[PDB]
Amino acid sequence: ERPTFYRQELNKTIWEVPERYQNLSPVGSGSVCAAFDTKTGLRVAVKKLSRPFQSIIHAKRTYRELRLLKHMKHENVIGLLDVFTPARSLEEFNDVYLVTHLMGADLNQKLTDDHVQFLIYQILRGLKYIHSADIIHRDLKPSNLAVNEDCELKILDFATRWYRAPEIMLNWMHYNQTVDIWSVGCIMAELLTGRTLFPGTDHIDQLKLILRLVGTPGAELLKKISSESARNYIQSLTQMPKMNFANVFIGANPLAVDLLEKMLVLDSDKRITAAQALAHAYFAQYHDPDDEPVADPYDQSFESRDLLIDEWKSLTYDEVISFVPP
């Protein structure tokens, strides 16, 4: 059966939610309220989408977000606890609310090596799963990594470009999933040193900092560059050698440094993958190959479709109705 809702007034909006969700307090601005799910005993975030069907693009984005959240079923990836609408029918369907775990903190005095191992391990475990679904995150950074008290980590979907892969800043397109491994390297570096690895003031400054660490592109990488203007600029640069990372990450676990060398490679084809990284000896204490699950195939065929608002809205409604809680 359908739950009983109650109506409230906060975030300048009316919130109509099932009564299981109690003591809503605004937390951010769609807008989010913290709540207590009386059914499960969990603290949750309830997000009321703003303007979900205002236009074709908003409607497709709303669908996109719901299909994504519904697919993600992994300990280290945010998942969907509930989705609801106060609407009794498609004709009434105007609002969408998404319920997830309420996380206390994000990753944004030094962490111990054991602790850095555990955090990066969980990132990589989550990323193996996301990548197995043929999804690329593209914006992994400390504000998209939630942690609880137990140091248990989840990757979030959610201006900083300090963790962005160099190919993205050069507008490459054709991105590999290993864009996300570059970002993991930057995050890991900062957990080890307590400072931003590549704190650029603009994208050129950032690229300059990257090249100083990893060196200018070698002939092997140049062979794969089709952009004539890019090639021309690159070969005009003073040749800089790759720094030895041990002399940059002083005192870090040698295994950490080794792993960083494998993540922070300019050529995206030569970067370690998430699945490979989980088997690296830095993670020996956490790695369990029978407990690093992969995702069912994720149908992103809708991305190639151009539909009407009402069609995206009906598809979304179908997804609300068919939701089954975890």
Ligand X SMILES: CCCCCCCCO[C@@H]1O[C@H](CO)[C@@H](O)[C@H](O)[C@H]1O
Q: Give catalytic residue positions.
A: 157
Using the rule CB under 6 A, is 134 a contact of ligand X? no
Using the rule CB under 6 A, is 267 a contact of ligand X? yes
- 194 annotated as a binding-site residue: no
Using the rule CB under 6 A, is 204 a contact of ligand X? yes
- 31 annotated as a binding-site residue: yes
* Phi/psi of residue 35, nearest 5 degrees: -155, 170
Using the rule CB under 6 A, is 264 a contact of ligand X? no
**CB nearer ligand X, residue 119 or residue 179:** 179
Q: Are 67 and 49 in contact (CB under 8 A)?
A: no
**CB nearer ligand X, residue 256 or residue 264:** 264
Using the rule CB under 6 A, is 215 a contact of ligand X? no
Site string for ligand X, 158-197 (x = CB under 6 A): --------xx--x-x-xxx---------------------
Site string for ligand X, 227-256 (x = CB under 6 A): ---x--xx----------------------
Span from 127-135, 136-144, 265-273, 277-285 in contact with ligand X (CB under 6 A): 265-273
* Phi/psi of residue 237, nearest 5 degrees: -75, 145
Q: Which residues contact 41 (CB under 8 A, 6 or more apart)?
A: none
Q: Are 53 and 35 in contact (CB under 8 A)?
A: no
Burial environment of residue 246 by CB neighbours within 10 A (0 to 12, 13 to 18, 19 or more): middle
Q: Are 189 and 197 in contact (CB under 8 A)?
A: yes
**How does DSSP classify residue 279?**
T
**CB nearer ligand X, residue 147 or residue 207:** 207
**CB nearer ligand X, residue 65 or residue 167:** 167
Assigned token pair, 168: 């993205």
Q: Kindly identify the residues of this chain, within the stretch 268-297, that bind ligand X according to CB under 6 A.
A: 268-269
**Residues forming a β-bridge with 47:** 32, 98
Q: How far is the CB of 126 from ligand X (least distance, A)?
A: 21
Q: Please compute, for residue 305, the number of CA atoms within 13 A of its CA located in the half-sphere on the CB side.
A: 15
Q: Are 217 and 231 in contact (CB under 8 A)?
A: no
- 47 annotated as a binding-site residue: yes
- Helices then strands, counting H and E runs in the chain, come out as 10, 10
**CB nearer ligand X, residue 5 or residue 172:** 172
Report the alpha-carbon distance of residue 184 to residue 178 in Å, rounded. Answer: 10
Question: Residues within the annotated binding site for ATP?
Answer: 27-32, 47
Binding site for ligand X (CB under 6 A): 166-167, 170, 172, 174-176, 204, 207, 217, 221, 224, 230, 233-234, 266-269
